[PDB]
Every structure is written in structure tokens, then in C-alpha cells.
């Protein structure tokens, strides 16, 4: 009934790596276990499959490529020798021939020699150029990698009117992306407004918050 | 080297309405009935909606019907609602002793039509934080319109600026079938600091004329 993969990180062009998968509600000689990854922006792509028996299969391009295997709690997906054309999440999912088919959540790897760097975070000030009683603020996450970034507000009791944008790559080969809210003007002096971002690849892990002008 | 053709994205419809999406295989799948249909919304992962051809699990709508056969399958959604908006893929089975076991298509994305909205817009100067670094981000955003289709112009001390934005825009929202657009202009704190008047100009089909937003910096 539930699956979740785990072990994506970021990793150097040739250094092997193992994404594993554990199942909960069910047993490995049960299901049917697939490996399935999508390149960001792109689509859906299968790697292989684990049978109920045991029997192993693999796609074509996948051939050589990746192990998949299992060990009586999870199965696994070896990235044998892994280069920047293997950079996307990977998916896990259990199907029982019939009616559950299953999906984790996915898990990122990146390929690249480029380092870590945690984010900066600075705010986007609720101003008069930011209407009546629809006040617009936002925090700006920059410089980041890699991947991923969560970000939310009042640490999550602010839910309506956010708008969190997906990240662009800039020039320097990090990545930036901004949250924004809006929100009654009637509140800016009231209320406090705190974006919590989380860049986990870093430990970073800041709460800014976002007040308005002098 | 199987490959599924699906129908040309995007593929749309408003709400109430009806859409059909093809797949067609280069080689019959298993048993002239084993093909499958994916519904991803972004960032999640994908949903079953159809298998076996036509099999429609539980807690699937009948909205979603499969047909089809060898090498020709489609899915059709009827009474189409707005968190519908997503992305479709077929998956097809094949003999594992003689080909690829699985393939799935390149997707079809379905966009919800609805009446065309206006973005409101807003401006962000740099914050003085960011400023003791020696960058300057300036930011607008462009907020709940229809279509997606919009112009960003940056203008600072009336030029117009290219090459140094970038912009990224939400997925359609499956409340609201509405999209939202960030663009980001970075200069030096040097040229940040040359300039004056610094304008985000929008042109959108729900404006006649563009909407300008403007701040002058240090006011």
C-alpha cells in the first residue's frame, strides 16, 4: 500500500551510487517492482523491472547501465557509472497486476562536479508599489546546488495565496527561485509574515522575515 | 527502440467539456490489450488511471474512459474539471523474452481554457542585504492571468534591457486555471546604483495597452 524511495544526492560524474525503495504494506515476492526516472521538464522514462518470481528485466538503453536487485525489505537501483545524462528523479513503484499501483514520492540525483552552496535568502518587501487590501510580499531564494529547495510560510499556516516559483539555472550554474504571497493590506503592521526556507542538500535552513519599508 | 507517438501537447478543453488523447505503438502490445494511462500532475508522481486498455481502477472516475487495441489506443476525458490539469502518458507492455517490457510516451499535456484574465502586477527593488554583497536582483511579478502567453519588458533609465532576466511561471492552478510569472533582472551593485528609474513593462491579450510598474531607486 505505501513505497518511498530514498538516496538521491548529489554526486561526481563517475561515482557509483544506489537509490533504494522500501515497501510497507506488502511483500517483494509480491508485487511487481519498476525503476522509473524523469529528466527535469522531460518525461517519463523506464528503467526495469523486478518480478513477483524474482526474474529481472531491463530496458534496453538501460542495459549495463543500472542493477536493480532486492534484499527482503527494499529494492534497490544501482547507477553503475553515472554521468550528467543520468541527472533526474527517480521514481519506485508496486503494482499487484490488479488494482493498487503504487508510487514514492521520487528522489533527486544530480550529476555534476560543480559543489554544494547553500542558499541566500533576502526579502521582497510588501511596498506601495507592491493595490488595497491585495499587498504583495515574498522572499527571494538565490545561489543555490543543487536541487531541491522547499519553501514555506508562517511555517505553514500561511497556505493561501503562495505562489512558489520553480527554480531557474543562472549563468554562474546555481540555481534561484522566489516564493511570493499576497495578503490583506490591512495586516502589514498586525500580523507577521516569515518565509521558511530548507535547502537540504546544505543544511541550510533560515527563516526570514519579511517586513515592510521606512 | 519501441516508441509510443501520443497526440501533440497541448491538447485542451474548458470545464464541462471533452477531451481525447491517441497513443499509437510501433508494435502491438501484449495481447492487443496491455496499455496503460498515467495522469502527473507536476511535482507529484504519476496516478493509474486506465490499464488493460480499458480496466478502470477504483477511485478513478468514469470520466476517464480507455479504448483501443494493437497498436492503436486512446484515453478520453468527459466533464472535464479544473484540477484535471496535468499531464497524460501511456505505458505499454510488451514480451519481455522479445522486446522492452515496458514504454512509455512522450505525454500529452492538458491545459483547462477559461476566460482571459488580466495579470495584477507588483515590483521588488533590492533589499540593502543583498545590496552589501555586490548584486541587485529587481523582481516583478505577474500574477492569477489567463492565457499563459505574456510579454516581460525591463526598462532601466528608459532602456530596454536583454540578456540579463530570467523568468520562470507556475503551473496552471487546479483551482483557478490561472498562471503566475516571476521575472528577475540581476545587475551589478555598480550599475544598480548608475540608474534611476527602474520599470517592468507587461503586454498581455487581457490588456490593450502594456501595464508599466516602476520604482525610482532610494524613494
Known amino acids: 500500500q505505501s513505497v518511498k524511495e530514498s538516496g538521491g544526492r548529489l554526486v561526481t560524474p563517475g561515482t557509483p551510487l544506489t537509490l533504494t525503495c522500501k515497501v510497507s504494506?506488502?511483500?517483494?515476492?509480491?508485487?511487481?517492482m519498476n525503476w522509473v526516472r524523469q529528466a527535469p521538464g522531460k518525461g517519463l522514462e523506464w528503467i526495469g523491472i523486478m518480478f513477483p518470481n524474482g526474474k529481472i528485466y531491463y530496458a534496453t538503453w538501460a542495459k549495463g547501465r543500472f542493477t536493480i536487485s532486492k534484499t527482503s525489505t527494499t529494492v534497490d537501483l544501482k547507477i553503475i557509472s553515472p554521468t550528467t545524462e543520468d541527472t533526474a528523479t527517480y521514481f519506485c513503484?508496486?503494482?499487484?497486476?490488479?488494482?493498487?499501483?503504487?508510487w514514492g514520492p521520487g528522489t533527486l540525483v544530480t550529476v555534476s562536479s560543480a559543489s554544494t552552496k547553500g542558499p541566500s535568502v533576502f526579502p521582497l518587501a510588501p511596498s506601495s508599489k507592491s493595490s488595497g487590501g491585495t499587498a504583495a510580499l515574498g522572499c527571494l531564494v538565490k545561489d543555490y546546488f543543487p536541487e531541491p529547495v522547499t519553501v514555506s510560510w508562517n511555517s505553514g499556516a500561511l497556505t493561501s495565496g503562495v505562489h512558489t516559483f520553480p527554480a531557474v539555472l543562472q549563468s554562474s550554474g546555481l540555481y534561484s527561485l522566489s516564493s511570493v504571497v499576497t495578503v490583506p493590506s490591512s495586516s502589514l503592521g498586525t500580523q507577521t509574515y516569515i518565509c521558511n526556507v530548507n535547502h537540504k542538500p546544505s543544511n541550510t535552513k533560515v527563516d526570514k522575515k519579511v517586513e515592510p519599508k521606512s | 527502440d519501441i516508441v509510443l507517438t501520443q497526440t501533440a501537447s497541448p491538447v485542451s478543453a474548458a470545464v464541462g467539456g471533452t477531451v481525447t488523447i491517441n497513443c499509437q505503438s510501433s508494435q502491438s502490445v501484449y495481447t492487443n490489450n496491455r496499455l496503460a494511462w498515467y495522469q502527473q500532475k507536476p511535482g507529484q508522481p504519476a496516478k493509474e488511471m486506465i490499464y488493460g486498455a480499458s480496466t478502470l481502477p477504483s477511485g478513478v472516475s468514469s470520466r476517464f474512459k480507455g479504448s483501443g487495441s494493437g497498436t492503436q489506443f486512446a484515453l478520453t476525458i468527459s466533464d472535464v474539471q479544473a484540477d484535471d490539469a496535468a499531464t497524460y502518458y501511456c505505458l505499454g507492455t510488451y514480451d519481455c523474452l522479445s522486446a522492452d517490457c515496458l514504454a512509455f510516451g512522450g505525454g500529452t499535456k492538458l491545459e483547462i481554457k477559461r476566460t482571459v484574465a488580466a495579470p495584477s502586477v507588483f515590483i521588488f527593488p533590492p533589499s540593502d542585504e543583498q545590496l552589501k554583497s555586490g548584486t541587485a536582483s529587481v523582481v516583478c511579478l505577474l500574477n492569477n492571468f489567463y492565457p499563459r502567453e505574456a510579454k516581460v519588458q525591463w526598462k532601466v533609465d528608459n532602456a530596454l534591457q536583454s540578456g540579463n532576466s530570467q523568468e520562470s511561471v507556475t503551473e496552471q492552478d487546479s483551482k483557478d486555471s490561472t498562471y503566475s510569472l516571476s521575472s528577475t533582472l540581476t545587475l551589478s551593485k555598480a550599475d544598480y546604483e548608475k540608474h534611476k528609474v527602474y520599470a517592468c513593462e507587461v503586454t498581455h491579450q487581457g490588456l490593450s495597452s502594456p501595464v508599466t510598474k516602476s520604482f525610482n531607486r532610494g524613494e
Open positions: 513503484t508496486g503494482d499487484d497486476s490488479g488494482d493498487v499501483n503504487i
Open positions: 504494506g506488502f511483500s517483494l515476492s509480491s508485487y511487481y
